[PDB]
C-alpha cells in the first residue's frame, strides 16, 4: 500500500475493434494501436510493456549503480522481448529482458541488474505471476 | 511456464541518459521519447505506457468476450486509466485505476463483460495480488 503517491500517468484509450489509439493527458503519448500481429500499423500491449517495463529498469540500474558509486556504460540498452501466449483458452505474458552493459566487470554489472530486478516497480506488480528471464547480454 | 503457444512476441530496445531516453519497436510501430516526468520534457514514461497497455489489453479482453456473447461494444468505447507511481518507506510501487465507459450498454451486460475482461486480461493476471488495482464502470 502506497503512503507518498509521486506521479500519476493518465491515458484515454478507444478502439475500433482491430485498430485503436491511445493519448496521455498531457500528450506525451499520443499512438495508434492495432491488434497484436494482425495488419495494422499502430502498436500493442506487448510492445507497449516491453517498453515501459525497460525504461523503469534502467532507472533501477541508475539508482543502484548511485547507491554503489559505479558508473554505468554510455552505450548501456535493455533489448526486451515480451511474449503473448495462450494455454488451452487462457492467455498470459512472458518476459526476457536482455541487459547490455559493455565495460562493467561481470560481478559488478550483475550486482546492478540483481539490484534493479528488485526495485523496479514493474518486476514487483509482476513478481511470481508471469515468467521472467533476466540477461546480462 | 504458463504459455503452451506464443502468439505474438513484441520486441523493443530502449535507451537512457538519465533526462532523456528512447525506444524504438523492432518494426518502428513504437518509436517514442522519454523524458523524466518531475520535467516539462516532451517524451513519455512507464507510467503512461502500462495504463496505455493495460487499457489496450483490457479491451481486447472486453472484444472477446462480447464476441462468444454475442454482444456488440459501443464504438465508442474507452478505458480512461491512471497508473500511479508510489512509495511506501524508500521502496517503489505501482497503483492503478481503469475506468470503463460503454456507452449505449446495458449495465447489467457492462458487468459481466468488465468482471470477465478482469480476469481473462494478461496484464490482469501479470499483475493480481501485488498492487492495488480498482475496475470501475462509468
Same mark, same amino acid.
Given at each position: %500500500?502506497?503512503?507518498?503517491?509521486?506521479?500519476?500517468? %493518465?491515458?484515454?484509450?478507444?478502439?475500433?475493434?482491430?485498430?485503436?489509439?491511445?493519448?496521455?493527458?498531457?500528450?506525451?503519448?499520443?499512438? *495508434?494501436?492495432?491488434?497484436?500481429?494482425?495488419?495494422?500499423?499502430?502498436?500493442?500491449?506487448? *510492445?507497449? @510493456?516491453?517498453?515501459?517495463?525497460?525504461?523503469?529498469?534502467?532507472?533501477?540500474? *541508475? =539508482?543502484?549503480?548511485?547507491?554503489? %558509486?559505479?558508473? =554505468?556504460?554510455?552505450? =548501456?540498452?535493455?533489448?526486451?522481448?515480451?511474449?503473448?501466449?495462450?494455454?488451452?483458452?487462457?492467455? @498470459?505474458?512472458?518476459?526476457?529482458?536482455?541487459?547490455?552493459?559493455?565495460?562493467?566487470?561481470?560481478?559488478?554489472?550483475?550486482?546492478?541488474?540483481?539490484?534493479?530486478?528488485?526495485?523496479?516497480?514493474?518486476? %514487483?506488480?509482476?513478481?511470481?505471476?508471469?515468467?521472467?528471464?533476466?540477461?546480462?547480454?
Amino acid at each position: %500500500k502506497i503512503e507518498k503517491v509521486l506521479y500519476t500517468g %493518465k491515458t484515454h484509450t478507444t478502439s475500433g475493434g482491430r485498430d485503436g489509439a491511445a493519448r496521455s493527458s498531457d500528450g506525451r503519448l499520443d499512438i *495508434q494501436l492495432s491488434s497484436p500481429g494482425s495488419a495494422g500499423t499502430g502498436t500493442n500491449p506487448e *510492445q507497449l @510493456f516491453a517498453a515501459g517495463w525497460s525504461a523503469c529498469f534502467i532507472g533501477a540500474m *541508475q =539508482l543502484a549503480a548511485r547507491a554503489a %558509486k559505479v558508473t =554505468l556504460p554510455a552505450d =548501456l540498452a535493455v533489448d526486451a522481448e515480451v511474449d503473448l501466449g495462450t494455454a488451452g483458452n487462457a492467455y @498470459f505474458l512472458q518476459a526476457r529482458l536482455n541487459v547490455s552493459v559493455p565495460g562493467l566487470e561481470r560481478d559488478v554489472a550483475q550486482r546492478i541488474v540483481d539490484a534493479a530486478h528488485q526495485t523496479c516497480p514493474y518486476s %514487483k506488480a509482476t513478481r511470481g505471476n508471469i515468467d521472467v528471464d533476466i540477461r546480462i547480454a
